[PDB]
Tab-separated table of C-alpha atoms and ligand atoms in Angstrom:
chain	number	residue	atom	x	y	z
L	18	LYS	CA	-52.599	138.413	43.788
L	19	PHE	CA	-52.844	135.932	46.501
L	20	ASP	CA	-51.449	132.954	48.131
L	21	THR	CA	-54.051	131.079	50.380
L	22	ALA	CA	-51.881	129.808	52.840
L	23	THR	CA	-52.727	128.019	55.656
L	24	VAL	CA	-53.333	129.540	59.588
L	25	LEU	CA	-50.496	127.607	61.820
L	26	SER	CA	-50.983	129.272	65.156
L	27	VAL	CA	-53.225	131.872	66.506
L	28	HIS	CA	-53.038	133.713	69.660
L	29	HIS	CA	-54.988	135.685	71.717
L	30	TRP	CA	-53.093	138.206	73.983
L	31	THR	CA	-56.005	141.035	74.982
L	32	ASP	CA	-59.031	141.007	74.708
L	33	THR	CA	-57.879	143.600	71.671
L	34	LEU	CA	-55.189	142.140	69.981
L	35	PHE	CA	-54.342	138.726	68.448
L	36	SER	CA	-52.003	137.213	66.315
L	37	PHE	CA	-51.373	134.416	64.262
L	38	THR	CA	-48.365	132.882	61.957
L	39	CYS	CA	-49.183	130.801	58.723
L	40	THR	CA	-47.857	128.247	56.169
L	41	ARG	CA	-45.619	131.039	53.323
L	42	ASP	CA	-45.083	130.464	49.624
L	43	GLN	CA	-41.334	130.191	48.704
L	44	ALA	CA	-42.292	133.376	46.120
L	45	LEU	CA	-42.708	134.830	49.674
L	46	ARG	CA	-39.867	137.395	49.954
L	47	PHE	CA	-39.378	140.365	51.527
L	48	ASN	CA	-37.169	143.053	53.359
L	49	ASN	CA	-38.231	143.212	57.389
L	50	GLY	CA	-39.556	145.901	57.636
L	51	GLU	CA	-42.145	145.188	54.873
L	52	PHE	CA	-46.291	144.453	54.799
L	53	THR	CA	-47.700	142.394	52.325
L	54	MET	CA	-52.380	142.146	52.811
L	55	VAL	CA	-54.005	140.114	54.286
L	56	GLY	CA	-57.527	138.894	54.002
L	57	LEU	CA	-60.431	136.853	53.869
L	58	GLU	CA	-62.836	136.193	51.496
L	59	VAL	CA	-65.352	137.153	52.479
L	60	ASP	CA	-69.306	136.570	49.065
L	61	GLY	CA	-67.073	135.375	47.034
L	62	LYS	CA	-64.081	137.592	46.742
L	63	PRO	CA	-61.381	138.991	48.734
L	64	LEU	CA	-61.626	141.135	51.743
L	65	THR	CA	-58.156	142.403	52.815
L	66	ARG	CA	-55.901	145.356	54.903
L	67	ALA	CA	-52.161	145.813	54.952
L	68	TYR	CA	-50.134	143.860	57.721
L	69	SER	CA	-46.816	144.171	58.547
L	70	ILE	CA	-44.706	141.567	58.499
L	71	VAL	CA	-43.469	140.509	62.052
L	72	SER	CA	-41.479	137.600	61.279
L	73	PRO	CA	-38.164	137.839	60.230
L	74	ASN	CA	-37.347	137.436	56.136
L	75	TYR	CA	-35.193	133.586	57.406
L	76	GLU	CA	-38.422	132.844	59.417
L	77	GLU	CA	-39.843	129.570	57.497
L	78	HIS	CA	-43.313	131.318	58.329
L	79	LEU	CA	-44.486	134.482	58.726
L	80	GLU	CA	-46.472	135.810	61.591
L	81	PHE	CA	-49.074	138.662	61.748
L	82	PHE	CA	-49.701	141.001	64.578
L	83	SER	CA	-53.660	142.331	64.531
L	84	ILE	CA	-55.727	144.755	66.288
L	85	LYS	CA	-60.045	143.912	66.535
L	86	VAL	CA	-62.006	146.861	65.513
L	87	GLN	CA	-65.386	147.022	66.886
L	88	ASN	CA	-66.909	146.529	63.098
L	89	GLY	CA	-64.170	146.555	61.696
L	90	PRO	CA	-64.730	144.662	58.389
L	91	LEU	CA	-61.840	142.622	58.572
L	92	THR	CA	-60.510	142.269	61.828
L	93	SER	CA	-63.762	140.972	62.828
L	94	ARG	CA	-64.387	138.419	60.871
L	95	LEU	CA	-59.721	137.593	61.332
L	96	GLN	CA	-59.941	137.625	64.698
L	97	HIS	CA	-61.843	133.915	65.308
L	98	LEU	CA	-59.081	131.929	63.427
L	99	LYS	CA	-58.620	128.303	63.661
L	100	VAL	CA	-55.319	126.497	63.226
L	101	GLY	CA	-56.007	125.174	60.003
L	102	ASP	CA	-57.897	128.131	58.675
L	103	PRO	CA	-56.988	129.190	55.077
L	104	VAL	CA	-55.831	133.347	54.656
L	105	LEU	CA	-54.940	134.879	51.689
L	106	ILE	CA	-51.881	136.862	51.757
L	107	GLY	CA	-50.262	139.090	48.956
L	108	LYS	CA	-47.799	137.700	46.999
L	109	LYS	CA	-45.968	141.220	46.482
L	110	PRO	CA	-44.669	143.125	49.401
L	111	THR	CA	-43.593	146.049	49.567
L	112	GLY	CA	-43.468	149.493	52.100
L	113	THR	CA	-40.778	152.283	52.801
L	114	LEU	CA	-39.592	150.979	56.180
L	115	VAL	CA	-36.161	150.008	55.058
L	116	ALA	CA	-32.943	150.922	56.332
L	117	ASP	CA	-31.676	150.797	52.803
L	118	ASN	CA	-33.015	154.009	52.601
L	119	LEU	CA	-32.016	155.705	55.257
L	120	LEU	CA	-27.614	156.799	54.629
L	121	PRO	CA	-24.968	155.110	57.496
L	122	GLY	CA	-25.322	156.586	60.606
L	123	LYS	CA	-24.439	155.223	64.757
L	124	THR	CA	-28.835	155.891	66.642
L	125	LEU	CA	-31.384	153.990	65.126
L	126	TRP	CA	-34.989	155.382	66.741
L	127	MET	CA	-38.349	153.455	65.927
L	128	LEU	CA	-40.867	155.742	67.190
L	129	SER	CA	-43.909	153.601	67.104
L	130	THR	CA	-47.900	154.130	68.736
L	131	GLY	CA	-50.243	151.276	68.453
L	132	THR	CA	-49.983	148.184	65.813
L	133	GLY	CA	-46.977	150.423	64.934
L	134	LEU	CA	-44.878	148.885	66.943
L	135	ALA	CA	-45.831	145.890	64.215
L	136	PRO	CA	-42.913	145.523	61.562
L	137	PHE	CA	-39.551	146.319	64.045
L	138	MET	CA	-40.372	142.932	65.021
L	139	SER	CA	-38.775	141.627	62.033
L	140	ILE	CA	-36.372	145.077	62.450
L	141	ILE	CA	-34.975	144.474	64.935
L	142	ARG	CA	-34.620	140.619	64.501
L	143	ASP	CA	-32.944	141.706	61.672
L	144	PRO	CA	-29.073	141.187	62.440
L	145	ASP	CA	-28.329	143.273	59.803
L	146	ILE	CA	-28.816	146.027	61.785
L	147	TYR	CA	-26.658	145.828	64.777
L	148	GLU	CA	-24.249	145.679	61.983
L	149	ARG	CA	-24.398	149.097	61.413
L	150	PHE	CA	-25.790	150.800	64.341
L	151	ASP	CA	-24.442	151.481	67.318
L	152	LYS	CA	-27.626	151.144	69.541
L	153	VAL	CA	-31.210	150.722	68.240
L	154	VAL	CA	-33.951	152.885	70.507
L	155	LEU	CA	-38.011	150.661	70.075
L	156	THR	CA	-40.357	153.832	71.516
L	157	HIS	CA	-43.928	152.292	71.796
L	158	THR	CA	-47.475	152.718	73.442
L	159	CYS	CA	-47.175	149.802	74.660
L	160	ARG	CA	-48.808	149.336	78.540
L	161	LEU	CA	-51.291	146.583	79.230
L	162	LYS	CA	-49.953	143.039	80.153
L	163	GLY	CA	-50.039	141.091	77.261
L	164	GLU	CA	-49.416	143.835	75.654
L	165	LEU	CA	-45.783	143.985	76.811
L	166	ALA	CA	-46.047	139.345	77.049
L	167	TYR	CA	-45.913	139.657	73.201
L	168	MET	CA	-43.059	142.144	72.779
L	169	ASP	CA	-41.300	139.433	75.349
L	170	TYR	CA	-42.617	136.248	72.634
L	171	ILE	CA	-41.247	137.951	70.054
L	172	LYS	CA	-37.676	139.212	70.754
L	173	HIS	CA	-36.089	135.755	72.426
L	174	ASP	CA	-38.069	133.999	68.696
L	175	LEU	CA	-34.645	134.386	66.886
L	176	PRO	CA	-34.857	131.273	64.588
L	177	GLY	CA	-30.829	130.585	63.528
L	178	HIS	CA	-30.244	133.465	64.742
L	179	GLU	CA	-29.607	132.587	68.919
L	180	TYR	CA	-26.186	134.786	69.587
L	181	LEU	CA	-29.284	137.578	68.218
L	182	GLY	CA	-30.043	137.055	71.891
L	183	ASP	CA	-27.104	139.023	73.079
L	184	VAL	CA	-27.227	141.241	71.037
L	185	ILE	CA	-30.238	142.599	71.192
L	186	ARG	CA	-29.507	142.413	75.369
L	187	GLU	CA	-26.717	144.887	74.719
L	188	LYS	CA	-27.953	147.630	71.930
L	189	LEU	CA	-31.750	147.586	72.066
L	190	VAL	CA	-33.194	149.644	73.969
L	191	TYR	CA	-37.311	150.216	74.757
L	192	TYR	CA	-38.403	153.330	75.717
L	193	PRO	CA	-42.305	153.610	76.653
L	194	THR	CA	-44.360	156.252	76.290
L	195	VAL	CA	-47.519	155.671	78.171
L	203	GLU	CA	-50.405	158.076	72.593
L	204	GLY	CA	-49.102	160.995	70.548
L	205	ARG	CA	-47.336	161.353	73.457
L	206	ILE	CA	-43.388	160.881	71.733
L	207	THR	CA	-43.305	164.080	69.751
L	208	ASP	CA	-43.997	166.005	72.902
L	209	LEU	CA	-40.919	164.011	74.374
L	210	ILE	CA	-39.369	165.239	71.877
L	211	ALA	CA	-39.839	168.442	72.261
L	212	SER	CA	-39.026	169.462	75.877
L	213	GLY	CA	-36.173	167.131	75.328
L	214	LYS	CA	-37.262	164.617	77.787
L	215	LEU	CA	-36.792	162.092	75.037
L	216	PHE	CA	-32.848	162.767	75.525
L	217	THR	CA	-32.363	163.188	79.091
L	218	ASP	CA	-34.765	160.347	79.787
L	219	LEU	CA	-31.859	157.764	77.482
L	220	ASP	CA	-29.227	160.290	78.108
L	221	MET	CA	-28.841	160.275	74.732
L	222	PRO	CA	-27.539	164.071	72.096
L	223	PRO	CA	-31.440	165.601	71.002
L	224	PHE	CA	-31.724	164.124	67.495
L	225	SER	CA	-28.803	165.800	64.162
L	226	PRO	CA	-28.209	163.965	60.959
L	227	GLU	CA	-24.547	163.463	61.450
L	228	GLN	CA	-25.708	160.507	64.034
L	229	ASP	CA	-29.614	160.100	64.110
L	230	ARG	CA	-31.279	157.733	61.436
L	231	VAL	CA	-35.425	157.364	61.963
L	232	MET	CA	-38.258	155.335	61.510
L	233	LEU	CA	-41.514	156.776	62.297
L	234	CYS	CA	-44.566	153.905	61.678
L	235	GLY	CA	-48.153	155.304	63.644
L	236	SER	CA	-51.036	157.898	63.167
L	237	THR	CA	-50.936	160.030	60.420
L	238	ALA	CA	-51.105	162.606	62.967
L	239	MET	CA	-48.102	161.291	65.087
L	240	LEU	CA	-46.567	160.952	61.351
L	241	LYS	CA	-46.888	164.749	60.483
L	242	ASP	CA	-46.332	166.028	63.756
L	243	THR	CA	-43.085	164.464	64.800
L	244	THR	CA	-41.580	165.220	60.833
L	245	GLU	CA	-41.792	167.830	61.993
L	246	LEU	CA	-39.633	168.122	64.836
L	247	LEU	CA	-37.260	165.742	62.628
L	248	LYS	CA	-36.941	167.935	59.455
L	249	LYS	CA	-36.402	171.091	61.899
L	250	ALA	CA	-33.630	169.455	63.701
L	251	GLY	CA	-32.185	168.651	59.820
L	252	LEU	CA	-33.047	165.792	58.870
L	253	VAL	CA	-34.099	164.430	55.862
L	254	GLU	CA	-36.870	161.890	54.662
L	255	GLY	CA	-35.436	159.291	52.938
L	256	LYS	CA	-36.469	157.128	49.260
L	257	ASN	CA	-35.152	154.874	46.884
L	258	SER	CA	-33.548	156.896	44.549
L	259	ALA	CA	-31.835	159.594	47.964
L	260	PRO	CA	-31.337	157.765	51.158
L	261	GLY	CA	-31.513	160.139	53.470
L	262	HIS	CA	-32.533	160.558	57.413
L	263	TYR	CA	-35.569	159.730	58.073
L	264	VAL	CA	-38.729	157.516	56.495
L	265	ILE	CA	-42.506	156.948	57.550
L	266	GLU	CA	-45.400	154.438	56.800
L	267	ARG	CA	-48.683	154.642	58.732
L	268	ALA	CA	-49.097	151.996	61.358
L	269	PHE	CA	-53.182	152.704	59.726
L	270	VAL	CA	-55.757	154.669	57.106
L	271	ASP	CA	-58.055	157.434	59.905
P	1	FAD	C1	-49.203	150.313	55.780
P	1	FAD	C2	-49.333	149.422	56.607
P	1	FAD	C3	-49.915	148.773	57.646
P	1	FAD	C4	-50.192	148.167	58.500
P	1	FAD	N1	-50.115	147.004	59.450
P	1	FAD	C5	-50.639	146.622	60.783
P	1	FAD	C6	-50.442	145.179	61.532
P	1	FAD	O1	-49.283	145.176	61.212
P	1	FAD	N2	-51.572	144.836	62.043
P	1	FAD	C7	-52.851	146.063	62.664
P	1	FAD	O2	-53.566	144.854	63.349
P	1	FAD	N3	-52.977	146.698	61.586
P	1	FAD	C8	-52.589	147.458	60.732
P	1	FAD	N4	-52.839	148.260	59.852
P	1	FAD	C9	-54.282	148.964	59.773
P	1	FAD	C10	-54.726	147.181	58.614
P	1	FAD	O3	-54.233	147.397	57.253
P	1	FAD	C11	-56.240	147.226	58.889
P	1	FAD	O4	-57.382	148.650	59.154
P	1	FAD	C12	-56.586	146.966	60.194
P	1	FAD	O5	-57.121	145.404	60.435
P	1	FAD	C13	-58.564	146.681	60.775
P	1	FAD	O6	-59.418	146.602	59.678
P	1	FAD	P1	-60.936	146.413	59.709
P	1	FAD	O7	-60.772	146.190	58.437
P	1	FAD	O8	-60.857	145.701	61.076
P	1	FAD	O9	-61.069	148.136	59.775
P	1	FAD	P2	-60.416	149.037	59.095
P	1	FAD	O10	-61.906	149.262	58.129
P	1	FAD	O11	-59.170	149.306	57.788
P	1	FAD	O12	-60.453	150.190	59.777
P	1	FAD	C14	-61.880	150.656	60.898
P	1	FAD	C15	-61.031	151.571	61.753
P	1	FAD	O13	-59.778	151.650	62.632
P	1	FAD	C16	-59.035	152.378	62.344
P	1	FAD	N5	-58.226	151.370	62.553
P	1	FAD	C17	-57.995	150.315	61.529
P	1	FAD	N6	-56.800	149.798	62.313
P	1	FAD	C18	-55.902	150.167	63.541
P	1	FAD	C19	-55.083	149.664	64.045
P	1	FAD	N7	-54.023	148.986	64.255
P	1	FAD	N8	-55.018	150.742	64.902
P	1	FAD	C20	-55.794	151.247	65.195
P	1	FAD	N9	-56.494	151.789	64.987
P	1	FAD	C21	-56.857	151.181	63.440
P	1	FAD	C22	-59.292	153.122	61.346
P	1	FAD	O14	-58.049	154.770	61.164
P	1	FAD	C23	-60.029	152.827	60.660
P	1	FAD	O15	-61.666	153.788	60.083
P	1	FAD	C24	-51.556	148.967	58.599
P	1	FAD	C25	-52.004	149.457	57.644
P	1	FAD	C26	-51.581	150.183	57.079
P	1	FAD	C27	-51.682	151.351	55.937
C-alpha cells in the first residue's frame, strides 16, 4: 500500500520543525489540500502518520512539513532523515480540504493553527483558487523566525507558475494570530475590523479550517451561528474542516 520514495532534500527550520522533499510515484495524484500517509519501516513493520502534502500537485516532487514531538514514535525518527534515505509514502491521498466542496463565493478564509498551515501551503499555490475568489486570507499561529522563514520560502516556490507571484501578492493576506486565539478574534469581531472585512456570512465567505480538535469545535460553532453549513462531496457548503493532529 506504500511507495518507497527517496528523500531529495531535508531542512531544519527550528529545533521543533523540519521539512523534506522526496520522489513522487506517477500514481500519486492529488488535489492541493489533501493528505497522505508518510512513515518508516520500524522493526519490520510500517510506522505511519497522516501528513498534508505541502507541495502543489504540479510540482514533480513531494514536500512535507513536520513537527518534532518529544517521545513521538514517528517524528522522533523522521527528524533524522537524510538525503538519499527511503521513506514510505501512502499511495492514496484523501481529505476534506477540497475546494470543490465549497459553493462559489467571494472570500476564502483559511484558519490554521500549528502545523495546520501545511495543507494551505499547497492550496495557496493552486492557480484555480485565485480564479474563483476575490481575496484569500490565511490565519496562522507562526511567531518564530524559522516558522515565518518557512512560509516565506514556500510562497515563492512556484515551478512552471511564476506568474502566480503577482497574483499571490495582490490577493493573499497572511494574518498572524499569536493557539485558539482565532475563535476569540472571530467572536469579538476584531478579526474583521483588523482586516477591514465584513463578518462571516454564507452569502460571501468560504472557510477552511485546519487546527486542533478544540479549535475546530469552537470555531465551527461560530460559523454555524453565522449560518454557514459544512460542505461535503454530496452537498457543497460554506466551510470544510480537518484536524491538524489527533488528541
Ligand atoms: C489529516 C491529518 C493531517 C496531518 N498533517 C500533519 C502535517 O502536515 N505535519 C505534521 O507535523 N503533523 C501532521 N499531522 C499529525 C501527524 O499525523 C502525526 O501525529 C505527527 O507526525 C506526530 O507523530 P508522532 O508519531 O511523532 O506523534 P503521535 O504519537 O502521532 O502523537 C504525539 C502527540 O503529539 C500531538 N501532536 C501530534 N502531531 C502534532 C502536530 N503536528 N502539532 C501539534 N501536536 C501534535 C498529538 O496530539 C499526539 O497526542 C496530521 C494529522 C492528521 C490526522
